Ligand binder design. Sequence first.
Ligand SMILES: Nc1nc2c(ncn2[C@H]2C[C@H](O)[C@@H](COP(=O)(O)OP(=O)(O)OP(=O)(O)O)O2)c(=O)[nH]1
Ligand SMILES: [Ca+2]
Ligand SMILES: [Ca+2]
Ligand SMILES: [Ca+2]
Length: 341
Amino acid sequence: MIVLFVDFDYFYAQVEEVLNPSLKGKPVVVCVFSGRFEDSGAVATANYEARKFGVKAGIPIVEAKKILPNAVYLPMRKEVYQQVSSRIMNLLREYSEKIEIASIDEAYLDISDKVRDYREAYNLGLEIKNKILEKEKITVTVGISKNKVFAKIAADMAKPNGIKVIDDEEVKRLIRELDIADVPGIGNITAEKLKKLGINKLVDTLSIEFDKLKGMIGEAKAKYLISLARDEYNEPIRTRVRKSIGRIVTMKRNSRNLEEIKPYLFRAIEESYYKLDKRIPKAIHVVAVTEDLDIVSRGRTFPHGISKETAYSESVKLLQKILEEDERKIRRIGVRFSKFI
DNA sequence: CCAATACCAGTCC
DNA sequence: GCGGACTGGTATTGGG
Ligand SMILES: Nc1nc2c(ncn2[C@H]2C[C@H](O)[C@@H](COP(=O)(O)OP(=O)(O)OP(=O)(O)O)O2)c(=O)[nH]1
Ligand SMILES: [Ca+2]
Ligand SMILES: [Ca+2]
Ligand SMILES: [Ca+2]
């Protein structure tokens, strides 16, 4: 298999630069303003100039400004970003029928039957990069390898505005030499657990008994790493079928007032049914985050489909149950739908 | 009952 | 701690 992965560079901020060329060369920080109070919220992304001066995704806007008062701070316009994204994804569909949209700015193409080797793949990667730049003025990074995981690792290594092939011999070398913390799916918390077990590289995952590994990180992640280490990973390129779909929102203020909370819950349900499209759920869960940041959920599974109308009325009953059985104020409220017909 | 179900903490990016 | 979605461990419960 030959997999080509495309990851758009500093995507949100780059879109803002496209829409305002006056911003280029300036530090640009795109932000999620929460509005629970002043300048509350977090950095969604920053361009590479802003990162140079200490601002990165996830930090509080409050801290970002203290850090880089000099930057241009912009509200997230996700609807605008989604439109650019959708057009780019349609461009990519032209290069292969076998496409997997992983997120608003990432997609994998299975080009096994489109090119004969990694030389032609590299060439296709350049064509893709040029076309996206020509049509949307967005730079992207391309990663190419024998499976999805190494194609992404390649992009991670080459960004931004890059292209990289990890060929079959390099896959073998990296199984031995790559810090396992750099494997997709392994965050800092998981990397640390592995380090305690004596695992620093993919190849090390085989030095331990499965039950010990599975007991530390779970069976799913254990089989994932083991497959990678044995170079057997070969997951098909295709859009994932979601097992659940929902929406949970932060409220303007904490509350236990049923009718102060209902409007957020109901909007959550509306956004959920838009996302659901033609999928019909058999299960609904109302999910609350309390004032001190615990989660409480109450669900119901039916032996049949739940239309939007039954979702509304049942969600009320489930919310009442949360409020009856937990005396804390609620901070976030929403719904998740699952068990599709 | 206790297997089936419900809850819900943890994890990724 | 803005958030969607999935995983898997532990608590609760329904049968009729
Ligand atoms: N609201 C919010 N959005 C995020 C967050 N993290 C990433 N995003 C969105 C906005 C970014 O443009 C995109 C980030 O994906 P990446 O890890 O590839 O970073 P980004 O494209 O911004 O920069 P990069 O690929 O490193 O050049 O996804 C986050 O923590 N909060
Ligand atoms: Ca990305
Ligand atoms: Ca990106
Ligand atoms: Ca990592």
